[PDB]
Structures are given as C-alpha cells and as structure tokens.
Symmetry: D3
Subunit: 292 residues, 6 copies
C-alpha cells in the first residue's frame, strides 16, 4: 500500500503544504474535484480535506501523516479527551509556516477580569474553555467557523477569541488584544501505530528533505568582487555559513570573487558597509536546500 | 433590536432557505462576502453561516431562529449532551425541503459491520446507533466525499447522507440500514422573545404555512359541456368544489376551475379529455390557506 | 440600426435590469465575455458595461437608453458640469428597484452627534462629487478619500475618520459601529434616454417598451386572491378586501349558498387582513402571481 | 434499471434542458462534479455531458433519451456515415428553445457578395461536416479551419478568410464586420430516443413525460388575461381578444353594467391590441402566467 | 507576418506549455477571454484553444507550431485518415511533460476477457485500431469526461482510460490489464515550409527548448570537504564532467566543491557524502543546460 | 503607525506589484476579500484597490506609497487640475513592468480624426492631445472593450492602450499616432514622512534597485580549455571579468563563470561552443548591485 498524507484542501496551509511536498520531490496532478491526488513518481497518496478533519484522521489511524496547525490539532485533541477518548499522535516537525496566535480581544471602547460574564465569539471553543477554566472566569459562548472578527460590531458578542497573524489586524477592527492564550504553527504529524518498514523508510527520506527545505528558508547565496587586501574586513561583515569561498578572476592578481551564504535580512543590513569596504558586482542567488 | 435568523451560507439548504424567506415577504440584498444580510423592508437580520454552526447559535441564544436539517441539529445536540451540557430549542415547523436519509452501506462485494472502519460525516449519530445495537467499529470522520472512502481503501463501509437509493448503487454500495431520516426545520431559541419579535415570528409562520400548503398544487381551468359536470367533478373535485363560469354566447359549454395536486391532475388528465374537457390550463399557486 | 440599451455589466442593478428587460419581451443570449448581447426577437442591442460609464454613454449619445441609479447619474452629471460641460438626458421612468441612500456616518459615540462634528475630518466615499456639493452647501470643510469599494472599512482600518456611504438598510451602519447622521441623497434605478431625438421607428419601439414597463411596475407587490365565502358575507369581505375595482363573483357547482370571490390585493394588505377574512367565513384562500397590471 | 437521459453539462441548452425536465415533474439534486444526477422522485438518471457526446450515446444505445441541437446531431450523424456506419435514432419532439442557424459569412466589402465568392477561401467553422456537405452539393472548393470556439475571430485575426458560424441573431455578424451570405442550416433543440425498443415500463415512463412536454410547449408565450368591461362591449372586445375558445364571463359584485372577462392570449398579440382594448372600455387588465396548456 | 503557435487553452498541459514558452524568452500578456495572446518582445502569436483542435490546425496549415499530447495528435490523425484525408506534420521534439498512458481496465484477467464488452473511452479511434489489430470485438461508449465512473455507474463494462499513475485505477476498483498507448507532450510544426525568417525564429527557439529540457531535474550542488577526500566524494558525485574545486578563506585543509547532479541521485547519496566529511551542502536551481 | 502602500487589487500590475514587494522582503497573507493585507514581518500595510483610486490616495495623502501606471497617474492628475486642484506626488522609480502605449487607431479600410467619435478609457489624455493639435472630435468613454467599439459601430476610432503593435492589426485597426507611453511607477505622497517611515522607504528602495538591475540577467557557468580564455572572454566578458575555477585532476581545462544578459548569451551561445565551451549552465540571479 501507499503512504497517505492528509493536507488542507484549500486555504492558508494548503498552498504551503503543497509547495513543501513538491520541494520534497513529490510530483502529483491535483484536480480540485478529487479527494485524493496520487503521486506520479512515489508511492504516496495526498488527501485534501477540511483542516478540522486532519487530526481525527491521524488519531484514528486512517492516514499515516498530516500537516496541520497546532491550534486545530489541540482543539480536536481536547474535544476528544472531553468525550472520554485518548487521542495520540507523533509530532515529527514543527514547520516554518502557519504562524499565528489565538488572542482574547475586546472593543477599544483593560483586564482579564473584564471578560467575566461576556459573550465571547470564537472558532476554537475548546481552547477558550480550557483557558477560562484555568483562570476561573465565566463567560457565554458563540461559536462561529468564519467571520469571528465581525461579531462584536454586529452585536453578536461582546468580545472574541480570534486567530491572528498580525497585531495590526485587531487594531484595524477597533479591537484591543488583551491576552494571547495560544501560539501555533504548522506541524507535520504521524499516526501512533508503527508503520511498515518500507513506509517508515519513505517517511525518513522525506524528513531529510524537509530539513533541507527548512534550513534554506530566508538564505541566499551571495557573490561579489573585492580586492584581496579587503578579505578580512569583508569576512567580518559577511562570514558565510563556514567561511567565504575565494575565487580567482581572469588575468587579475589584485581582486577576487568571494561567495558566501547569508540570511537575506543580514545581507541587506550590511550591504552598504560591504560597498564602503570595496565590494562590487554583488549578486544574490536563491538556495533551495541547505544541509548542515 | 432586529430578529436574527441563521441560514446555511451556501449549499443544499441555502437556496431553499432564501427562497422560503423571500416567499414569506422578506426582501434583502445578499452580498457573498458579508456574514449578515439585512432585510430592507422588515426588522430582520439573516446570518449566513456554515450549517454546522446553526444549532449552536440557537442553543446559545445568539440568534432567534434558524433553518437547519434535523440531521445536523441532532448531531450537534448529541455532541453537546456528551460534553455534559443541556441544549434546548423550540421546533416551529418541519419544512418541505432537505429530505435525505443517513444510511449504513457496504460494498456490493448488520452484524456484518462488527469491527469495520466506517466513514461518516455524522460520527455522533453513528455512535449512538451502534451503541444501541451493541456493535463495535472503528471511526473515520470526513466532512466531504464519504462515498469515496471504500473504493479508495480508507474505510470498509460508510454511514452516508443520501437523497436517492440509486446514488449508492452507482458507487457499488448496497444500502443496508437507514439509521436516520431528516428534513429541513425551522427552529427557535428557548428563551422567550420580546413581544414585538414574537409577533413578527407569528406573522411569518402564518405565511410559511401558506407556502407549504400550496406546494405541489396547481389551479386547473378547462372547458366542458354543462352536461358533463358531474363526471368531471368526480375526476377533479377541487379543494371544495369546482367553480363554474359561463362562456360568451354559449349555453352548452362552461369553464370549470379547480385546485388539484399536480400529480393527481396528470394521472386523470387523459380521462378528463375522454369526458369532453378541452383547453385545459395549469396555473401556479403561491400560497394556500385552509 | 438597432436600439441600444446600456445596463450594468454585473451587480446589484444588473440582475434586475436583465429581469426587467426580459419581462418587457426582450429575449437575448448573454455571454459574460461580450460587451454586447443582441436580442434574438427584437432590433435591440444590450450593452453591458461598468455602471459608471452609463451616464456618459447617454450624455454623449452613444446609446439610446440606459438603466442606472440616480446616484451614479448625478455624480457624473456633476463631474461633467464642473469640467464646464452641459450634460443632458431624458428621464423616462423611476423604477421600483435599486433603492438606496447616501449617508454621512461617524463612529458611534453614546451622544448626540452633529453635522458640525464633520469639520476637518477625512471622509471616505465613492461619490466625491455628491459629497462635495453637500458640504459646500452646508459650509463644512473636510479632507477627501475616494475609494471605489469597501468604503465601510475605512474608519476601522484608520484610513479615514468618517464615511459617506451607500446603504440599503439602516442596520448596516450600526453593524460596523457607525451612526447614520445625515442622509444627503436618496436614489433608485431609472430608465433614461439620450437628448437627441430618435428615429420614428426607434421611438415607437421605446414607446412599446414603456407600456410594458408600466405594466410590470404596477403589478409589483400585488397578487390575485381567490377564496370561498357564503353569499351572505359578501359585503363584509368586500370591506376587508375591496379588489382593485370590486370583487369578481363566481358560482360554485351545485351550490347556491356559497360563491368564489376573486380580488387583486397588495400582498402585505392581504396578509394583514387574512385572519379577519377567516373569521368572516372565508375558506380555501389562494394567492396567485400577477405579472402585469394595466390601469 | 432506471431511465437514462443525457443533457448538456453546461451552457446554452443546459439550463433550458434542466428547466424542462423540472417542469415535467423530474426532481433532482445537481452537483457540478458528478456525471450523473439521480431523480429523487422518479426512476430517472440524468447524465450531464459535453454536447458533442450526446448523439453518440444515443446512437450506441448507452442512454435512452437525449436533448440536443439538430446541428450537433446532424454533424455527428454525418461523421459516422462518412466512416461507413449507420447511426439511427428516434426523433420524439422538436423543442421551442435552442434556435440558431449556421451561416456562411465574409468580411464586409462595399459591394454585393455571393456564393461563388467563397471559391478557394479558407473557411473557419465548428461544424466541418455540415460545411463539407453543403459545399459539395454546390460544387465549391475551399480550405478548412476547424475551431471549437471563437470562430468569429478567425477572419480579423487572419486565421481564415471567411467563416461558417453558428448565430442566434443577424446583428452579431454585422458587429464583427461580417456579412451573412447564405444560411446553410437551421437548428433547434430536440428530444431524441435510441433505436432499440425500451422495456414496457421505461416506454410508459417516456410516454408520461411526453404528455407533459406537450403541455409545457403549448403554453410557451401564452398568458391568462383578465379585465373589466361594460357588458355592452363584449362583442367588440371578443373580436380583439378572442381567447383560445371564447371569453369566460364573470359577474362583478353589486354591478349589472360591467363584467370581468378572461381569455388566454399569446403575449405578443395581447400587447399589440392592448391600447385598442382600452379604447373599447377595458380596465384593470391583468396578465397571469400559464405553466401548461393542453388542447 | 508573425509566427503562430497553438497551445491548450486550459488544463495542466496549458500551464506547462506557457511556462516552457516563457523560459524560451517569449514574453506575453494572457487575458482568459482572448483567443490570441501576442508576444510583446518577439513576432509570435499564441493561440489558446481546445486541445482537440490543435492537430487540425497544424494539419490544415492554419498555425505554424503546436504543443499537444501524442495521444490527441494520433487520435485526430486516425480520424482524418479514416475520412480518407492525408494529414501530415513535422515532429520537432518530444517534451518532458504530459506523460500518461492509455490503458484498458476492468473491474477487479486477460485481453480475451474484453470480447463483447462495452468499453468507455475518450479516445475511440485509438481503441478501435488496437482492437482490430488484436481481433477483438466490443461495443463503444464515447465520453469526453468522467470515463472512470462508467463501470460503477453501469454505463459500460470496462474502460480505456488515460492515466498518469497506476494507483488511480486501483482506487476506482479497476485493474489495469493492458497499456495500449504511451504519450507525452510534443512540439510539432506544419508540413509546408515556413518563410526563411520564421524558420530561423523556430530554430532559435529550439536551441532554448533543448537547454530547458536538458536542465530538468538537475541541480547545482555545492559543498565543503577536506582536500584529502576529493577522490571519494568525486566518486559519489562526479558532476557532468568533473567537480569544480574552490579555495576557502584562510584554510589550506578544506575546499569547496561544485557539481551538477540529477536531484534524485543527489538525495540517494547525500548521507554517504556526509559520512565522507562533506558539510554545508547547498542545492541551487539550474534553468538551462547545454552540452 | 505602519507604512501604507497601495497596489492594484487585481489586474495587469497586480501580480507584478505583489511579486516585487515579496522580492523586497515584504511577507504577507493576501486574502481576496480584504482591503488590507498586513505584513507579517515589517510595519507595512498593503492596500489592494482599483487602479483608478491609487493616484487619488497618493494626492490626498491617505497612503504613503503607490504602484501605478503613468497613464492612470496622469489621467487622474489632469482630471484634478481641470477641477481646479493642485495634485502633487514624488516619483521614486520607474519600474521595469507595465509597459504599454496609448494609441489613436482607425479602421484599416491625424486630420482624418476631425469630427470622428473616438472611444477611449482615458478621456483626459485624449482631450489634452487633441486640444494641443487643434482637432475636434466626439467622445465615447468605455472602461473596458474599447477595441470592439468600431466594429460594433459605437465609434469611428479609438484611443486604446496596447502592449503590442499586432493587437490592433488583429482587430483590423491601424495604429496612426502614439500619444502616450507608460510603465509602472513607484510613487510617494508629497508631505514628508516620519523619520522611521522614510528610513523604511529607503531600505526598500535599495532592494528595488537590486531587483531591477538583475532583470533579464543570468549567471553563466561553462567549461573551456585554459588556452581559449581570451577568445571566450571576448564573447562573454561578464559584468567585470570571468571568474576562473580549477577542475578536479585537470590542468588543461577550467570552469568560467560570468554574468550576462540572457539575450546576449543566446546570441553568442553557438560561437561559444565553436570555441570549445562545454557543459554550459544558466542560473537565475535575483538581485544585482553595482
Ligand atoms: N563558502 C561559503 C559558501 C558555501 C557554502 N557551501 C558551499 N559554499 C560559505 O561558507 O557560506
Ligand atoms: N372552487 C375551486 C377553486 C378554488 C379554490 N379557492 C378558490 N377557488 C376548488 O374548490 O378547488
Ligand atoms: N375583479 C377583481 C379582480 C380583477 C381585476 N381585473 C380582473 N379581475 C378586482 O377588481 O380586484
Ligand atoms: N375561456 C378562455 C379562458 C380559458 C381557457 N380554458 C379555460 N379558460 C379562453 O377560451 O381563452
Ligand atoms: N564542474 C562541475 C560544475 C559545472 C558544470 N558546468 C560548469 N560547472 C560539473 O562538471 O558538474
Ligand atoms: N566574475 C563574473 C561573475 C561575478 C559577478 N559577481 C561575482 N561574480 C562577472 O564578472 O560577470
Ligand atoms: K454595533
Ligand atoms: K459593423
Ligand atoms: K453498479
Ligand atoms: K481499491
Ligand atoms: K487582420
């Protein structure tokens, strides 16, 4: 049988989940009508489903791997625990996308006790519940799967417990963030029961590549020209991951090419200082995978 | 404040819920981006939400009315009971759309379900039914595409919502047991409404009944010889008795009008013609009141 | 040549404009890519364009008729007048759709809020010219923020302090924590025609269409009511449901005591007296549609 | 087994085919992903497919009924005949929708243009087989350019010199600077059935449906007219609006001078005599829909 | 006049065709309504049409080049031959996308097991030719879409269906029995000679197409290793010719080594490279490669 | 407060504007419903609006930066000047996308425009040009489909935006006069920014230059005999001079690397092979700094 991986059918995670699988060498033809997309080059089946189903599919052993936000994973874990079940899974990797936080927020027109008795709208009723029990606060519930941010101005609720990627989003609905109750990111998870030897080996291969993809994010390959005499000064500004590669230029004994891996943001931050030190013809090139 | 009604944002019930509101006199401009559509002529706000949210909004008193399938309503009632809560609501009316049933099905190739993985969108309904019948099974919850699960080797069987027997046969599945029958309902929250809101609900309910009573009925008109009245009346009696109308410069023939269920009309149409009926017209009826 | 009519390509007006033309006997095949849809049964070309173009096409005589909101029409009339031009058109009919109003609104304060409270504010709107005229007439100064869509977001996103916005319902503003302070313009859809006379044949076609437009308008919100009642109750029922002139009375087979009565009624009035009709002995009451009514 | 009917998946005929089945009492849930929609109240399966497949499915007996344009039906019939096969089917009914024609057209020149002007030209079309037969019959040679869509663009894009195009309106060609020169085929929607006899129960179901289809067709374009007039004017009004048979005459409450008159009329004839009805004393004129009419 | 190229209007094939033209230096603005997109930098017109029209446009000389699957090309060639015509074209290049196969499949078993069955397919002409040659009789069911549903919906007994993956059939409870046709995208040209200037433009494009094709699945690998390990690493990752060797700053023990590699071979030897002392290994894209 | 940048919501520029911001280090989550997208890593808000609004938002100081075509910018500048206002803005950079021209065209069948009805989306640019040339004409403003106007008999001629000469010829129109040439620009409002906002703009501009300088350039690598260095250098000089790299166990051949414009590379590629170049690679370059 083939390895089954469940990803979000469409949405935030979906594009990034697909891109990640593609960079890990999985080729597939995705038809928006089909539940499953079959890999053309590897024994892998990609299930594209509603995000909320993914944890359950992993807990129940229906699929082997899943990519899902920690928030959705924990919300569902809690729902199942409170129904008396014992869900389990293996965390393989916390990914570098899907960054967001779950925040209690009130109208700008302030404290945690100010939430006592309020109606609070959320898509994550279970995370909200646990947090309010732990802090001894009573409140009335209003579960909406979408458009939570509109609830207060539409007079459906007094406050919200909303997922945001940016502080500014709340301010732009005249809401003040009061307490962050959960921080999340996309994870790659695996079901509890051991896989067959061949499936596990395939998972291991994929993980090597996942690390390579993750390690390269935000990094670029920098090339420049400088006088040999300036090597030490430039190296101090742009050290590389180990040390600069040094390359001769044709018919030139005074100048060299230097190559270094750098985080893109650090490069821009020292770019003008590199020029002051005599660097010229500076190139930025992409890197798709990095292995330490 | 305005009366809040929650309906399905898009889908099976969404079109019918909107149509029904429109036939009940509610005018509104629906923008697919907004959560709320405000009625332009009445103090009513229509919330367009995911179906699965509607029961919760009614249980928690966030909205006043909802239109939702019995299946989704009961699934969510069960989930809340099993978390120890006590959800309540008022059933106002079982509606004439949204008919479907939840059915256990197996590949063509009840104790036969013991130990199987069963895919469903309604895990809680499935659970209750299998407890009541002492059957153990493994779960596979999918929100869409449950019918694919067996042929894709995700599960051995399904507990699927269907509107037609034939759908299962066309995925090489045999229906084995119907475990739930559902249809659209209009429901209201438990806590009493204000006097003005309740009066508005009452008005709407009079019209809803009118809409429901007229479904499948048509106004039939025809010409016949006066001599044939009795024979035609026996074929098409009307809701009370035929209206009889003179025709210009004619003493031998008349027009007759009667309400009829559309299916009964077609069933007796040829016999009406054999009895001398001609120029037969079928007109729509939008509301009927007893 | 064929008569040209311009309607909104997509949107609020758009569905209703098409429906109206269809009820006036115009059959056509609408392909979402084409500028023009040609009528299959009449010499009429329907141009489907951005709403904002329609007034200009009528002013410049490019098309013969148009269906457009008064608000868009006047905004564009003002823009052209302020560029020194003299736009003109014929108003044929105000239609029973596209109702909305243009309203100054501010963020809610639990207080009486005034027109002077707009002095110095940045005000977002899609109708800068209507806003401008109104604020000159009331001697108020303000800063401008023209957005073609999403005006209601401007205050909460901190792009502006206030808005001048099109609303169909009072409640919409309340639901963005905005208080309607002053209605500056009321609008509905209109059918308009260019200034320069049409050819005799085109004008005759317009006249035909107008007869039907009136028939469509006059029937909106009306229904044909039919019911059974005892003859003895005629006067009491007639007082409750008078009809457009007087009830039609129709015999029932083999019955001298009861009759059928038919009357046209506004749907809302019918529902308002429905229970009283039943108390007076009415039964098997039917509501049927009416597509056109002519006085 | 259930009766199988094939209709166009999306497009021109698609909406009308579905509407027609619905008016014939077939209830179904149509999901845009599925090939088949199953009727919820009758033993009928609706296949929604590409139009070009339908004739083949009927010819090969895969389905029992189909709704398809004559043009597509004949194009496919010809293709199969020229491959040596013998396709057959039963025509049940020609429907009142899908009207269009296939026309040879050229770029406008300031001159009279004719059929011999096509000799040697490259002619773009979606119906190569209908074009071929017509040009053989008229002894004209030409070069082919088959496009499934956008045939109207071929001349201006310099892909071809001329076209043989499907149009619903004369004006569409004029509006691409093409002159219609010869109509080579006229088409409309048809309901067809496969050659091999159906089971008794399936055939009885087909027969039921056909009774309704006729009722639907006979009512198209007809309305139920009601009005008030003085009894004295009956003869004059009857001459203007005779009805299907003769006017129904109905008393009005407490009135011996006026009556209500009801008559079925084609909508167009009604509008054509409407003003004359008013001149003869008609008032409160109503137009009501009719869904089915049976002779 | 400008060079005309026909490509699929929409579908997966459409995107790869556009990407390929873009990597060959053709810039254009594509509006989903227009038949034609005009190149902004070259005298080229791109026609975006239904796939099934492309062979015909080439056969009839309406356009100069086309990108189309072999399956669709041969299906239409056969249809035209059987109507007595003589279609011709030039094959310029078999491309590196659009791989699929046309397979007879039955519900979950031989070729003789197809005798007398109704077989659904979108390629009736390919199916016909194959069954004549093998002396098998069968009844036809032509569907342009959803062929895989035909057996379970009881429209047919079997199918002759295009597939990109073995697993797709197994997931509809169908067993692949015989592959009757293998296909991939091709670049083709009409039969009649082009003008000198158009043919020269085609030739330029072809040089780039080859460069694009030769680079697919290859990456530029860079790493650090001790000078002492050069031979062992070279044996694991030989490069297209031989590793480039580069000094590192203030270091006489270690060097950087660069080599082109097929991506799959790289991953297959990656851990062995690390065992041999490789570190800071980078994978970089390559857009074109020329021999 | 955060820096506000306005870009086209959807359209020609829209994708390129987003790409350019992304290459300048702005990460964001773009939901097609929202007016604003907030940058996740920088204090920047991206407003996605109709193109025609962008100049106004800059002139009125509502936003800090905008990306817009010169054509739309000047059309709106003119409209505002003719209403008596004084719009101003700072041009930061002419970008390398959005190239097009506004051209008077007639049916194939300048004084020839006197008295004609001329359709256009840019009435104000047309007006100014015709005043300057003393020509009278009648107007027909359409926001879309201007090219259809003559064949549909809505106008006699057009003043249309085109990216290619061939587009007009393919509607049987002849280009007669180019009246305006445009490309996308990055512009900024007139009133000074806060020190911190201006510094952020300056950072972004350094990157924008890097992006622009790299467009159409590639990093070329190849093998050649050491003896052929001079001949190859003359064919492919690099931006300064070729990098030269030893190959393993080889004293006769070397690797050479050079930056080149992609078109010049293809133009000399066969001559490089004649001179003994082999294993030639083309790699992308994302930014180049002088
Ligand atoms: N030597 C440079 C670049 C490089 C890494 N790996 C290979 N080359 C660095 O250490 O960053
Ligand atoms: N008298 C007819 C029709 C009718 C009902 N109500 C009014 N008219 C019947 O009893 O069916
Ligand atoms: N006589 C009824 C119904 C009617 C109007 N016109 C024809 N019939 C009324 O006046 O309302
Ligand atoms: N008596 C009218 C209306 C009618 C037809 N059928 C029943 N009523 C006519 O002959 O047209
Ligand atoms: N010399 C290395 C890298 C390279 C190829 N071409 C230029 N450099 C190899 O042969 O793979
Ligand atoms: N030295 C080569 C490549 C290069 C530029 N910058 C760094 N390396 C050139 O001058 O084009
Ligand atoms: K509020
Ligand atoms: K014309
Ligand atoms: K079956
Ligand atoms: K299977
Ligand atoms: K041309």
């Amino acid at each position: 049988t083939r390895l089954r991986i469940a990803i979000q059918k469409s949405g935030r995670l979906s594009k990034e989940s697909i891109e990640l699988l593609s960079e890990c060498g999985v080729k597939m033809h995705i038809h928006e009508q089909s539940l499953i997309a079959f890999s053309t080059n590897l024994p892998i089946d990609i299930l594209r489903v509603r995000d909320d189903d993914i944890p359950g599919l992993i807990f129940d052993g229906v699929v082997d791997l899943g990519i899902i936000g920690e928030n959705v994973l924990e919300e569902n874990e809690l729902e199942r625990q409170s129904l008396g079940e014992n869900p389990s899974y293996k965390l393989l990797k916390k990914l570098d996308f899907g960054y967001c936080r779950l925040s209690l927020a009130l109208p700008q027109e302030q404290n945690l006790k100010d939430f006592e008795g309020l109606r609070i709208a959320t898509s994550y009723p279970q995370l909200l519940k646990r947090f309010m029990k732990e802090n001894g606060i009573n409140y009335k519930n209003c579960t909406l799967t979408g458009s939570v941010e509109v609830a207060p101005r539409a007079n459906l609720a007094d406050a919200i417990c909303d997922l945001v990627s940016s502080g500014a989003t709340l301010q732009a609905n005249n809401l003040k963030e009061v307490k962050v109750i959960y921080e999340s990111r996309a994870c790659l998870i695996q079901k509890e029961n051991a896989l067959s030897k061949e499936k596990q080996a395939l998972v291991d291969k994929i993980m090597l590549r996942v690390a390579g993809v993750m390690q390269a994010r935000e990094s670029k390959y920098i090339m420049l020209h400088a006088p040999k005499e300036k090597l030490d000064k430039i190296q101090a500004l742009l050290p590389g991951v180990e040390r600069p590669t040094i390359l001769p230029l044709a018919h030139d004994e005074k100048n060299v090419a230097l190559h270094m891996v750098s985080k893109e943001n650090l490069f821009w931050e020292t770019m003008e200082a590199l020029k002051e030190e005599g660097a010229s013809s500076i190139l930025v090139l992409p890197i798709e995978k990095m292995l330490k």
